[PDB]
């Protein structure tokens, strides 16, 4: 379980041991069939499929779908996500967030540099690079291209060498040795590419695919600007990530990565990129010009495994990775700012388009505030952070509900948000531009989409509550609840 | 399965046969413990408990909890609800609504009057009535009193005999022969009670508990004013509900009812009633005066079964009966009005505080309208109906999503409702008074709580859609979906 956080291939073997992997020996087609199978996996919360035989691919190459999809067994539903951190099968949202925040306070552990690693078993330089020999999928029927990178991370470094950035972003196949993909300017790849542009230079770059599962997660996390993901990963697993130099450009990448691509990000050349089915659950019809990523060389492990994300309606890894990592970061932002927040959760059902903030009702009275002022304080703090910029809508609710349970968030939205008083739009705050409901007005302006929905009743700002909860937990005395819990299977219910 | 719609005792036996009833022979206390156990049932979607061994209660008397609670098996989740209509284990929300709507179109089938029936096996008159001998529960810790009636229906009739009304409402025990509970003026009990009061008279009344499951559902339904529930029930099951007359006041009640109460609703006498854990999930702290229901006589079957509802957080019968019934009625109301609506669903998770309307996107462009004007059209039509009065919030979304699935509703709310454009408050429209978020200013005005949340993208009003959906159903061609489903076991998924 622990080695799984640090070694993709081992992670795969451990899922199999958990009964959470299906070995697909059938020949499958990288043209849409992989994608369709993997979508059905997500939606049924089926085991992760390991595809062993992809039509017309490099012999022995493999593909892993649904690397952090959910399981149908509610008791173990988050286990595949949890395994990315070496956590056990029953770990839930709260356990994962608390782990990730402990790592934020721990001293970083820098990567350990090695001479050699399995990612070097096969090496393709220059004209030997032919990305089309990999099992590169056409993921959705209406996508603009096949995607090589949907579950790997970009690896760049500040010109000054002070900041090593690992970040997940998509990369479409353009040709035998060129990809293209977005570099949004508020993302760390955009920021670092701009630093190179100010020197007149393209950005040296690599991508790691089938990377250590914990590094993949951290690559998916909006850590603050200037924080090296590699050292955060070391802190989290409590030992260094072992890294090797690329063949051609001096970047350090994980030594046991399945597949490493290397080259540079062009200053000015672009290819029409996308569209792709995306995290919000939709497939917009038109692509946009995006920077070319020139692949100068690449290396891979024997029988290399390409993990993928078949993005779309929830739950897929834009929810279970992205969402979860955003949640942990936002709770840290919120607490460090002195907000009375004890949990944040980006509900997977809301497709990483809202974040629910659990409010410590024991702390709210002392603020001497009200809903509107509180909403504006939270909007400023949260949307102002690197992590909160990513999420357009915030819901604030008291911590009597569990924010990780959509049914309880629903109850609170319906029964606590007052139509006249509790819907706070923040149309001056700049938007994350992928948000699906933005209209042309919002796009021209760069703002319009942001919202806080308040589910704190007015009396909660005075430390009061209009009514108790009519539930087993809250409508019966403690000794009675224990008698019922104790006698339950003896009444006749057994396991029910 | 059809007999279950018509006979409570049979319905119980059928649940047991399906594996959906637990017989509790351990001794239990009606003071909270029954309540607590049955709350946990709902919450765990456990089978329904039949309690056979209750402290200090009439010998042979039984209590049924969670009469239409949900099951944990997702494929059979709604069976217990479905069985109220004689529908099979796999029946879902859409099947149920389709059946209830078919019954609206069908000619009423009036009840069949019988001389005799099992509810008359035991008769208590006058001084013989002692309601406290029953296993009358204290349902929640902070309730103001024990409730005799939480899963039974009031039976009254217009002074002119034209309208026979069956309707579910709570009744709190006051003493050995008096109960008390609300008769809110917009409900049919309240309306009919006011007709008697205009004659200077109390209203003759009975309550049926452990009544035929289909009659109970209908009693829970906001049929239009003047529509006799008993006729609708006969149209629904295809045959007469068999009824007998009460001992003392000429009302006709179902013949195989477990327990029938009868007396009258006082013109002016009140007792402090409530509070009670309620539909919306909460226990408010203070009770209010409500009319006395004088119990002159009662009758019951041997070994009578008292069914209860332990109201509160979802899903309980305020959701699965009440919400499901409202939903069916609202869909009829919408369609009769010419609204492009193909399903309505009061999500159980929202505790009967919102209704989700599935909009037929093929019909929307022809209206030549926009979100604000449509929301107002829908608000007027829906909130002005008897059914829609009851629900403060409406969500409008295109019918590409399945509105009976909360996860899909959430997706739409998160990804479609634009913060600047799609939040339509209707502060002049009169509220249902039980809505929990209402403030003092709303209560004094009698309005303020109503809202329409729009999740129709603007381009849907022109028949367009900015993007397709990236799912197994929508991102792959039909031949490929069929291939995947056909080869699923070949791939290794078993
Ligand atoms: C988990 C994950 C996160 C993706 C993502 C994917 C997944 C699977 C894909 C590849 C399926 C779909 C889109 N990816 C993009 C992405 N961010 C981005 O700027 N462009 C992307 O194309 N994100 C989010 C990004 O990885 C997080 O915002 C990180 O915080 C970025 O790292 P940074 O904070 O250091 O910039
Ligand atoms: K990152
Ligand atoms: K009714
Ligand atoms: Mn970063
Ligand atoms: Mn009626």
Instruction: Name the one residue in this structure whose structure tokens are 């286990």.
Output: A79
- Residues 6 or more apart whose CB falls under 8 angstroms from that of B37 comprise A484, A491, B24, B28, B49, B65
- What resolution (Å)? 1.6
- Residues 6 or more apart whose CB falls under 8 angstroms from that of B192 comprise B156, B157, B158, B163, B165, B203
**Of B213, B112, B128, which Cα lies nearest the Cα of B177?**
B128
- Residues 6 or more apart whose CB falls under 8 angstroms from that of A345 comprise A93, A97, A327, A355, A356, A358, A403, A404
C-alpha dihedral over B103, B105, B107, B112, to 10 degrees?
Answer: 20
Other Cβ atoms closer than 10 A to A221: 25
- Could you tell me which residues are beta bridge partners of residue B262? B206, B297
**Which residues in chain A have Cβ-Cβ distances shorter than 8 Å to B313?**
411, 469-471
Plot region of B439 (φ>0 → left; ψ -120 to 50 → alpha; else → beta): beta
CB pairs A-B closer than 8 Å: 274
Classify residue B141 by burial, with Cβ atoms within 10 Å: 0-12, 13-18, 19+.
middle
Classify strands B147-149 and B393-398 as parallel, antiparallel or unpaired.
unpaired
Q: How many CA atoms lie within 13 A of A155 on its CB side?
A: 24
- Decide if B449 touches A, using CB distance below 8 A: yes
CA distance B37 to A314: 35
Other Cβ atoms closer than 10 A to A186: 14
CA distance A147 to A170: 7
CA distance B392 to B394: 7
Distance from CA of A54 to the nearest CA of B (A): 13
- Decide if A443 touches B, using CB distance below 8 A: no
The span from the first CA to the last CA of chain B, in angstroms, equals 33
- Could you tell me which residues are beta bridge partners of residue B355? B394
Give the CA angle between residues A318, A319, A323 to the nearest 5°.
100
Give the residue extent of every domain in chain B.
1-328, 329-457, 458-494
Pocket of ligand 1, beta carbon within 6 A: A 150-151, 165, 167-170, 182, 184, 187-189, 220-223, 279, 309, 311, 317-318, 321-322, 390
Residue A424: φ, ψ to 5°: -110, 100
Q: Which of residues 58-77 of B touch A (CB under 8 A)?
A: 72
C-alpha dihedral over B27, B33, B36, B40, to 10 degrees?
Answer: -10
Cα of B195 vs centre of ligand 5, distance in Å, is 15
- Decide if B472 touches A, using CB distance below 8 A: yes
- Quick one: closest CA in B to A393, which residue? B414
Q: Active-site residue A194, yes or no?
A: no
Distance from CA of A27 to the nearest CA of B (A): 9
**Of A204, A226, A220, A237, which Cα lies nearest the Cα of A83?**
A237
Q: Tokens in use for B100?
A: 């209830």
Instruction: Name the one residue in this structure whose structure tokens are 């002022």.
Output: A373
CB B86 within 8 A of CB B237: yes
Using the beta-carbon criterion (under 8 Å), do B40 and A439 form an inter-chain contact? Answer: no
- Decide if B407 touches A, using CB distance below 8 A: yes
Ligand nearest to the CA of B163: 5
**Of B73, B89, B93, which Cα lies nearest the Cα of B18?**
B89
- Could you tell me which residues are beta bridge partners of residue B155? B166, B206
Using the beta-carbon criterion (under 8 Å), do B493 and A448 form an inter-chain contact? Answer: no
Other Cβ atoms closer than 10 A to B490: 10
Q: How many CA atoms lie within 13 A of B327 on its CB side?
A: 33
Other Cβ atoms closer than 10 A to A384: 13
Q: Tokens in use for A392?
A: 């357009």
Q: Tokens in use for A436?
A: 């699906």
Using the beta-carbon criterion (under 8 Å), do A448 and B280 form an inter-chain contact? Answer: no
Q: What is the CA radius of gyration of chain A?
A: 23
**Of A219, A187, A431, A180, which Cα lies nearest the Cα of A317?**
A219
CA distance A396 to A424: 11
The span from the first CA to the last CA of chain A, in angstroms, equals 31
Q: Tokens in use for A50?
A: 């390991």
Closest partner residue to B281 among A32, A33, A411, by Cβ?
A411
CA distances from A246 to A116, A165, A305 (A): 11, 15, 19
Give the CA angle between residues A96, A98, A102 to the nearest 5°.
120
Mutual orientation of helices A324-336 and A93-105 as an angle, nearest 10°?
60
Using the beta-carbon criterion (under 8 Å), do A484 and B354 form an inter-chain contact? Answer: no
3-state secondary structure chain A: CHHHHHCHHHHHHHHHHCCCEEEEEEEECCECHHHHHHHHHHHHCCCEEEEEEECCCCCCCEEECCCCCCCCCHHHCCHHHHHHHCCCCCCCHHHHHHHHHHHHHCCCCCCEECCCCHHHCEEEEHHHCCHHHCCCCECCCCCCCCEEECCEEEEEECCCCCCEEEEECCEEEEECCEEECCCCCCCHHHHHHHHHHHCCCCEEEEEEECCCHHHHHHHCCCCCCCCCHHHHHHHHHCCCCEEEECCCCCCEEECCCCEEEEEEEEEEEEEEECCCCCCCCEECCCCEEEEEEEEEEEEECCCCEEECCCCCCCCCHHHHHHHHHHHHHHHHHHHHCCCCEEEEECCHHHCCCEEEEEECHHHHHHHCCCHHHHHHHHHHHHHCCCCHHHCCEEEEEECCCCCCCHHHHHHHHHHHCCCCCCEEECCCCECCCCCCCCCHHHHHHCECCCEEEECCCHHHHHCCCCCEECCCCCCCCHHHHHHHHHHHHHHHHCCC
């Amino acid at each position: 379980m622990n080695r799984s956080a640090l070694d993709f291939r081992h992670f795969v073997d451990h899922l199999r041991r958990q009964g959470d992997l299906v070995d697909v020996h059938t020949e499958v087609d990288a043209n849409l069939e992989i994608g369709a199978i993997t979508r059905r996996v997500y939606e049924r919360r089926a085991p992760a499929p390991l595809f062993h035989n992809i039509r017309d691919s490099l012999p022995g190459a493999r593909v892993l779908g649904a690397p952090a999809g959910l399981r149908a067994d509610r008791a173990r539903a988050h286990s595949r996500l949890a395994l990315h951190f070496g956590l056990p099968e029953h770990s839930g949202p709260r356990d994962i967030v608390a782990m990730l925040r402990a790592a934020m306070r721990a001293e970083p552990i820098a990567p350990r540099r090695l001479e050699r690693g399995p990612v070097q078993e096969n090496v393709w330089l220059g004209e030997q690079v032919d990305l089309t020999r990999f099992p590169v999928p056409l993921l959705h029927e209406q996508d603009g291209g096949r995607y090589f990178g949907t579950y790997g991370f970009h690896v760049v470094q500040t010109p000054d060498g002070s900041w090593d950035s690992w970040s997940v972003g998509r990369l479409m196949l353009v040709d035998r040795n060129t990809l293209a993909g977005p570099t949004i300017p508020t993302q760390h790849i955009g920021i670092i590419r701009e630093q190179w542009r100010r020197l007149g230079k393209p950005t040296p770059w690599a991508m790691a695919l089938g990377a250590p599962p914990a590094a993949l997660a951290a690559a998916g996390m909006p850590l603050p600007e200037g924080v090296s993901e590699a050292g955060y990963v070391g802190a989290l697993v409590g030992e260094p990530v072992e890294v090797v130099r690329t063949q051609t450009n001096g970047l350090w990448v994980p030594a046991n990565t399945e597949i490493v691509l290397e080259g540079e990000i062009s200053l000015d050349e672009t290819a029409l990129e996308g569209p792709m089915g995306e995290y919000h659950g939709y497939s917009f019809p038109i692509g946009k010009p995006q920077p070319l990523f020139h692949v100068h060389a690449l290396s891979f492990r024997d029988q290399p495994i390409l993990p993928i994300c078949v993005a779309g309606t929830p739950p897929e890894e834009n929810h279970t990775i992205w969402g979860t990592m955003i949640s942990a970061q936002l709770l840290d932002v919120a607490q460090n700012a002195g907000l009375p927040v004890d949990m944040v959760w980006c509900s997977y059902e809301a497709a990483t388009c809202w974040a629910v903030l659990s409010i410590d009702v024991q702390r709210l009275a002392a603020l001497g505030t009200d809903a509107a002022a509180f909403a504006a304080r939270v909007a400023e703090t949260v949307f102002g952070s690197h992590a909160g910029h990513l999420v357009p809508k915030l819901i604030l609710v008291g911590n009597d509900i569990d924010v990780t349970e959509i049914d309880q968030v629903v109850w609170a939205l319906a029964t606590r948000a007052h139509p006249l008083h509790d819907h706070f739009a923040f149309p001056q705050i700049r938007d994350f531009p992928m948000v699906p409901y933005l209209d042309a007005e919002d796009k021209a302006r760069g703002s319009g989409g942001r919202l806080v929905i308040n589910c704190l009743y007015p009396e909660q700002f005075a430390g009061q509550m209009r009514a108790a909860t009519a539930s087993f937990r809250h409508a019966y005395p403690t000794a009675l609840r224990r008698r019922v819990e104790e006698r339950w299977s003896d009444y006749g219910f057994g396991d029910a």
